Amino acid sequence: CPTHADSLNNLANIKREQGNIEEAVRLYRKALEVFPEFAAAHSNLASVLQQQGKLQEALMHYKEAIRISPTFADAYSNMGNTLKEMQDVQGALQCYTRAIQINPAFADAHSNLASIHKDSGNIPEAIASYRTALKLKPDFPDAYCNLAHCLQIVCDWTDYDERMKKLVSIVADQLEKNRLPSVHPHHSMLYPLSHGFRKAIAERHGNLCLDKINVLHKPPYEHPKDLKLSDGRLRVGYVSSDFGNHPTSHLMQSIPGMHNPDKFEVFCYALSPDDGTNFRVKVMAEANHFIDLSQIPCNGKAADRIHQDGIHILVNMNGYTKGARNELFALRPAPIQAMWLGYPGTSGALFMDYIITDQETSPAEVAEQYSEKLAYMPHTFFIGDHANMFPHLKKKAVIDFKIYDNRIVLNGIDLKAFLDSLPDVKIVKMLNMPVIPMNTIAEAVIEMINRGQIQITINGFSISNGLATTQINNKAATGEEVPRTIIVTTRSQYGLPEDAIVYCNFNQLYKIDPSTLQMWANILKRVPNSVLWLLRFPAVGEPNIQQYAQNMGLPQNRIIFSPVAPKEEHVRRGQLADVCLDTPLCNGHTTGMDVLWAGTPMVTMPGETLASRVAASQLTCLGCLELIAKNRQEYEDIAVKLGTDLEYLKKVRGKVWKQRISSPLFNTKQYTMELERLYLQMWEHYAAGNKPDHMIK
Amino acid sequence: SNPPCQTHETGTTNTATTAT
């Protein structure tokens, strides 16, 4: 019967919107039982199956719908979404373009096609496609919210104020009607939403994971309640898709190997395959046990594996990011599950017990922002492997083209040995600083930079052009290995002025909003001889920033843009700046550690979200409270004082250069120990028969 | 190369088809 099958299909659509996916599947299947050749029911069934993580079964039903109805545009577009989730970009593209070819007015297909362009890095094409979708369907939350993020990425601030209003209005209407918000949980930190809204957005994304594991019908796991089976050792499992060349490994790759094997047994669960980098090698070698879960795509079997290892504390290092398999945590194969380091925000999910943070990053007065209980590290929860990855930057020398500490810089493992052969070198007290005069050697080095030569040899020592590291050693450029040569870094390499203050920020441009650039403009206006140093991250954002700066009274020559660089050059060239100006909307996190390792003072203004308070936490651990602003006026004043009072700048720069070593900020050994103390507090609390509570010491 | 960063996949929109 036509009416019978139609009613079943349409009611199932209603159940789907209500969040009752199980009943939806049931009704779709009954529809197909009544009317086997029902194209709409095949396509609609495949959609809920997709939402349940049954991707291959979805594809089969999509193809069946299309066999029955060759011009079924909805089926093509929906199939594209499945192929995209399967990382089949070309297949997804072919489905979207076919759908658009069938129906050019198909708004959903345009918006879905836009997401491919967006994730490919083709932001202008994504923007154009999202605008086509909104032209066809003006009320379209997915298209509008993703378009807004596209505009954020390239710093397009056209009607930014009304954009923010619309975004907030959309999230409010979606949360009220119990829908999955169109704003991604990570992106929510960028918009003037309430903390309640941000946590609710996260919560609903965590609910997607529950939809995927509910169809497994797995019973709850029995959890260990003593350390007997592990000979008194606590079994900690680190779960990450980022064991490899990824900022996550650049921060914590030394941590598994530094755990005390008398009290801890380290399990690393990789969600990604081996990328062949030294980062992956190190973790595989230093972890007590390394498990490649990318070989076990079934979440039920993967969680079974974790449980069989007898993990006491499972650590989530992904949150809502690419490669995540939070279905593993939703299944609860471990009695204690904690968010750590990787994701700058709450999961919003019940299956996560703790978020490892600190008092500075996450004060108790903003604890409602998180769904997890707070677990405090004594200093900062943040860490970096800089001392291990870039020890060639521990010491430096300069060439006096006449004394500056950041115009022409040399670094190297054998730098001290090289300087021994140069008897005319002066040691200037600021650890102090060796200064090479304008001699034969210095002229040879400077000629190399001016002529774009790759490297030269002096007294047997290899002296490298800092721009040419990849041509000399690929592994050294990525941070996989320590550079062996003496490297030369100059302001001339990046078109930075020789006699002016350089304020820098090396973050992705999305972290900048109109209010931030305005604040930076106020600073530059008060420091006559000063420029702002930013990255083409991406390059298409550059003319936008320049325009808005000009409108704020800043000449175009006051802002200098450089390309993104390999990991090692990026950290190293931070030495050329005088001061880093941190982004208040969302701080530099990894990039914050990067700049401090270079010995460059960072000025910050902590907000309320976790992401906006990390830099202040780093600086507090470093021991430079004077670089933390309580408001915008103070942020500007601090930055201006550093740019105008040159003796104060010298003092602060010297303080950072010294304390990056002496403070616990880059001490991975101390970090691991304190992380261990925190793990034990978590365990004893649980072992005493208690539900998780704030471990705020 | 462009450096690896913290990345998020962009959500897509499924189309529900009503039967007539």
Ligand SMILES: CC(=O)N[C@@H]1[C@@H](O)[C@H](O)[C@@H](CO)S[C@@H]1OP(=O)(O)OP(=O)(O)OC[C@H]1O[C@@H](n2ccc(=O)[nH]c2=O)[C@H](O)[C@@H]1O
């Ligand atoms: C807001 C947010 O997402 N925060 C996250 C944190 O919460 C996580 O704890 C960090 C580890 O997972 S990642 C992330 O930290 P962020 O500080 O935002 O860095 P992001 O994801 O843009 O990467 C830029 C990279 O390019 C490198 N980089 C940069 C410029 C350059 O020229 N060359 C280069 O190699 C840099 O060294 C970086 O390695």
